[model samples]
Target: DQVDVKDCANNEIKKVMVDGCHGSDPCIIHRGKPFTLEALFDANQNTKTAKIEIKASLDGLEIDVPGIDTNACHFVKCPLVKGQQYDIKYTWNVPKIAPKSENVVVTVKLIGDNGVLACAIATHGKIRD
Candidate 1:
């Protein structure tokens, strides 16, 4: 991928496109933009809410990123069922911030009225310099 700040420098934001996955698997996406992505797992769980997080790493040593911007992380109301595997379609951009390549993990936990409904995980990559 061509990494040029000038190209998308001013608008290098990672977006999210939430889609409910029933029979198959749930899904999260980038809306052809960018996002601080306060929580990659805290999805739009309608009937309830959830707590999801993102951890970026390089050389398996863990990368130092942002924090628990709980304000940015909120549920939208996903029609998707309770428990299921989720597939993420990420259109990586000029990363609002980060090395350039490495291993990353996004863990999500569904906090529903019935205690915890499910815990889903999605991994990512990016590291360099």
Candidate 2:
């Protein structure tokens, strides 16, 4: 798969999709283009709000995607119900603050009041012009 998704929240995060690249290769991101990132997961607890965190790693150096709104409720629905499956999607423009690299790793986490509801990492990514 272009984006290898790994569960970091006890299998709560069922799937991860990076744009149209969700296979065994590397996801390609145009430097100035907008791309969509999505996550499918099961809600483990009832929560009023869900927060999101994103980090990217290049050459073993990790950094946050600055200026991203951390509130995931903007993308998904509010008051997540327990045991319900959800798909949360966010469109992003590769900001100038984000480092450019041929191979960058990305990790995303969906946090809830009870704790993390989902966590997944994209093992491969290509940031290009």
Candidate 3:
């Protein structure tokens, strides 16, 4: 028997920057200020593990920032305070039997540490067979 599953809602995030990593590298530039990153994912089926990785680059230096891992839909946040141009990248690992037609939308928001909304960005891609 075939079962139907629904996709996750696209969280409305603006001003922030988002990118997808297929074969091309995704990156975001931050002017060195307090910001937040929100990553959204949709596991069409039961996923064993979902891993997300993020890397930040500034002043010719790069640092790896780990993202939230889950088996369902959710968002992850990261705060940046250092004032410098930042280059960001992301990657994900999911089960091999996961849905291929379903698309996961990941959004990143740059906000103040004090709960002030600054900017937001979003990107999405479908799981391929």
For 1-129, candidate 2 gives per-residue lDDT tens digits of 225556466366666666533434465455444455566777778777767776766433455655365456655665654856688654565444344464666677777788788777666776653
Q: Write the per-residue lDDT of candidate 1 for residues 1-129, one digit (tens) a residue.
A: 112111111121232332211111211222223422221232223333333333433233353324453422333333223442233222234333444433444433434343433343344423321
Q: Which stretches of candidate 1 lie over 4 Å from their true place?
A: 1-50, 54-91, 94-100, 115-118, 122-129
What number of clashing residue pairs does each candidate have, in the order they appear? 15, 6, 11
lDDT of each: 0.31, 0.61, 0.28
lDDT of 3 by residue, 21-109 (tens): 23112222232232223333222222233233333332223234344434111333332223222233233222232333233333332
Tell me the deviation in Å of residue 62 in model 1.
Answer: 11
User: In TM-score terms, which candidate is top?
Assistant: 2
After superposing candidate 2, which stretches have Cα over 4 Å from the reference? 10-14, 19-37, 55-70, 81-84, 90-105, 127-129
lDDT-based ranking: 2, 1, 3
Report how far off residue 28 is in candidate 3 (Å): 18
Task: Give per-model CA RMSD.
Answer: 12.8, 6.0, 16.2
Off by over 4 Å in 3: 1-20, 23-80, 83-93, 99-101, 113-122
- Evaluated at residue 50, the lDDT of candidate 3 is 28
User: What does the lDDT read for residue 95 in candidate 1?
Assistant: 32
